Ligand binder design. Structure first.
Ligand SMILES: *Cc1cc2c(cc1C)nc1c(=O)[nH]c(=O)nc-1n2C[C@H](O)[C@H](O)[C@H](O)COP(=O)(O)OP(=O)(O)OC[C@H]1O[C@@H](n2cnc3c(N)ncnc32)[C@H](O)[C@@H]1O
Ligand SMILES: *Cc1cc2c(cc1C)nc1c(=O)[nH]c(=O)nc-1n2C[C@H](O)[C@H](O)[C@H](O)COP(=O)(O)OP(=O)(O)OC[C@H]1O[C@@H](n2cnc3c(N)ncnc32)[C@H](O)[C@@H]1O
Lengths: 441, 441
């Protein structure tokens, strides 16, 4: 339990995304599950809130005055090739999970970025490059080991505590900290994917075709569109530097033949500054988004879920987020539907299953820039479900009403009840917080 | 000691490049140095030859009737950040070395392909993407642990056995099997590199400019040119498929500013089908050549060293290896000079230091194809040093005269003497073999 101004406090308290500028009263760099339970026990004695950080990818509330458990040293993974499952400790990032599953020819339902904490991602739902085919990562869990608000370790399956197994798979840490989880693995060894990086002048054309194209693709095709002003930086090749880029991401988990057939029409649009679409070992999946996770940064994230992508919706995005807009934020359009739209084998509380698309924005916190982001998301409200994707929400989305928007009204009702039952003092509240039901007080 | 038709013989006997179709009398999958010494002791009892394989990247002679030591399980690496050195076990591939050195911001002098066995590469010399700046990997060794032909383990430094330290660093396994080595590490954290992938019609223009360009670059710029008929395969992006490609590889180990300045003129040539030149973590270095090492293959490798690349030399390469040639082999032109051309701090036997370029060919063994390869290398003999790069030699280069061409005449004289002294029965002869001096009998 490091305290402020002790050696390595800052090390253990600060994550990748610093937008929640937070100062925990103590930080425990847990080495194992016992240290996690001990940290939680301590906090319960001191009537203190408890938060958990594996990477700092997903900030929400300030950890001021809280105990923060840093799980980054708990990076254990083990694979059961026979049963096609992996055991993943609290702090294991997907890159490490992939190291272990690839030798067997197995893939988890990981996301766009290998740097991301597998557990935090999963308990938000977890929308990746196999998701349109298989669903949310939270829909494919065998069991959980959990530190509950009394500081007890508990093994949990759909069998032993339905309520808790349901709530944790989409509820983040609101019901306890996950020390390890057992996930189903899938026989995926290769992807046909990469990017079509179009010049700015093509943005309207591309987004219009994309809106149509997505209506015909199978569930094996995950795809998204990034719109970004790229700086003149050496970290990207010369065709992408210092200009507006519309980047179409492909991730087809079937045969390259099929993928290429689907993709080929998109090439008739242009000009294409760079084309990386290719057959790759699934291990290389993190090259499709190639998201920078080396330096810490501050970013204000916000997203809305779209019931549909229409011409007029496209035109708003072109106008407020395309080349001439001069928007100082990145915009990403991610395709959902498919398996995401169908109820999971084993129920969970993951919301937004009716969404066709996620529309995401990432912004340096600066008032002119945040205004334009606001204007863009407001102008899309008519094509919006009212929902937000929880894993793509940011530090501005911390109020109870903002968190409610991540769940269906019924799921949230039930979640409030379960929360009262498993976290009566609302100890896990350094998070996208589900408040205890008022009826349970 | 697996024998033929025992479970896992084929596993342990066959490597990546199968061009030496070899059947060892026994294969020892050594777990540690003691098993290696025991294997060598056994062979010395039985008057049998001994070969060593970590990956099968570098075949030469058939292992028929030999004992083969497979070192692939000896993959240990440890790094001394303070002293900037790594300890590398026999079988460790560069990818694993890189895993350990990158967290400290250190780089070994590895080569184009992370799949390659660090030790085998180094004892051939070892020409990589930092070589023009720092020299051969064999020029930066602190010590070796070696199993000599009596089966004894021996720690060797420039201090304790000058003759042996000299000979092993360029002599491959001719003087004993290396169980571990201690290499100097360099403070390189990033490269500016990648490819300019030009269409076939530009090949003459590019090779002519390259010939000139290389005369002005600093030692921080490693570069090469691949000429290849790419099949219509899904493993490469659509611009590179089913056509002739001239691929210019850049690897600048200075500041991106400097790299870009150097590279920019090359873009004035064209058309460029794809441009990947960018600032990257040095860990990603294996993306510059992106050589396929997943499937085994058969390949007949041959190279000649060039004293200079002239217009007429270029025109022969264009004519016999460029788009209209219909050559069924790959051709690679690699730039040497720089630190390679200067004597190493601590002497070694690595030859070809006077070469400006390596010209390499890789061929499926088929007589029409091998004829054209022969014709190309013969037609370049006037611009040739007479030498060959040992690490780039193949199964056709196994005769004493072919191996002599890898060393200066004096070095080879001395090498024959040392060989008689350390391997009097020529036990290590499943290799590019240095025969014992006749004067020592
Ligand atoms: C940064 C980022 C995030 C990201 C992404 C790409 C990047 C560059 N791509 C995603 C994608 O393709 N699909 C997706 O669904 N999400 C994606 N994300 C977001 C990511 O899922 C979330 O940010 C998630 O929170 C990441 O978890 P991580 O553990 O890495 O992050 P954290 O800040 O350290 O923790 C955030 C919250 O996660 C919950 N959490 C963390 N550990 C636990 C444990 N052990 N038990 C229970 N809950 C846990 C907490 O709520 C914590 O506050
Ligand atoms: C396949 C390949 C090779 C390669 C390369 C790229 C690819 C795809 N790029 C290279 C590069 O950029 N620069 C360079 O200098 N060489 C490059 N190579 C060639 C490589 O250096 C050689 O092929 C080398 O022989 C590789 O060694 P490896 O150990 O991987 O290969 P092997 O077939 O299993 O062994 C070949 C011979 O190496 C000597 N050897 C191997 N292990 C030992 C030990 N422990 N002690 C002593 N000698 C050893 C033997 O002579 C063995 O026969």
């Amino acid at each position: 339990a490091l305290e402020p101004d002790q050696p390595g406090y800052d090390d253990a308290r600060l994550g990748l995304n610093r937008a929640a500028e937070s100062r925990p009263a103590y930080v425990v760099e847990a080495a194992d599950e016992q240290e996690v339970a001990a940290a939680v026990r301590l906090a319960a004695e001191q009537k203190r809130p408890v938060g958990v950080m594996a990477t700092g990818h997903g900030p929400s509330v300030s950890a001021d005055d809280a105990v923060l458990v840093n799980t980054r040293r708990m990076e254990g993974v083990s694979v059961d090739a026979a049963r096609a499952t992996a055991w993943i400790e609290a702090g294991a990032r997907w890159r490490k999970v992939l190291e272990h599953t690839a030798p067997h020819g197995l893939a988890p339902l990981n996301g766009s970025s290998p740097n991301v904490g597998a557990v935090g991602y999963l308990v938000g739902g977890g929308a990746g490059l196999l998701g349109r085919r298989f669903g949310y990562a939270a829909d494919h869990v065998r069991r959980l080991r959990l530190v509950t608000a009394d500081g007890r370790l508990r093994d949990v399956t759909a069998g032993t505590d339905p309520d808790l197994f349901w709530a944790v798979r989409g509820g983040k840490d609101n019901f306890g900290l996950v020390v390890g989880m057992e996930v189903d693995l899938f026989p995926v060894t290769r992807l046909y994917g990469g990017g079509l990086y179009f010049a700015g002048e093509a943005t309207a054309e591309v987004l219009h075709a994309y809106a149509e194209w997505v209506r015909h693709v199978p569930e094996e095709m995950a795809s998204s569109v990034l719109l970004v002003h790229n700086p003149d930086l050496p970290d990207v090749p010369e065709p992408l530097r210092g200009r507006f880029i519309t980047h179409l991401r492909i991730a087809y988990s079937g045969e390259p033949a099929d993928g290429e057939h689907l993709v080929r029409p998109l090439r008739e649009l242009g000009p294409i500054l760079l084309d990386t679409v290719r057959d790759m070992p699934y291990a290389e999946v993190g090259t499709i988004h190639h998201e920078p996770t080396s330096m810490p940064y501050v970013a204000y994230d916000r997203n809305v879920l779209l019931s549909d992508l229409t011409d007029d919706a496209v035109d708003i995005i072109v106008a407020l987020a395309g080349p001439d807009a001069g928007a100082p934020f990145v915009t990403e359009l991610r395709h959902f539907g498919g398996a995401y739209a169908r109820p999971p084998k084993v129920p969970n509380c993951v919301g937004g299953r009716d969404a066709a698309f996620s529309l995401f924005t990432g912004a340096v916190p600066e008032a002119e820039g945040l205004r334009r982001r606001d204007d863009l998301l407001d102008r899309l409200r008519p094509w919006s479900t009212g929902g937000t994707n929880l894993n793509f929400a940011g530090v501005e989305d911390i109020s109870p009403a903002s968190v409610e928007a991540a769940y269906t009204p019924a799921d949230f009702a039930r979640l409030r009840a379960v929360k009262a039952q498993y976290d009566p003092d609302n100890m896990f509240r350094v998070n996208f917080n589900i408040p205890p039901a008022e009826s349970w007080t």
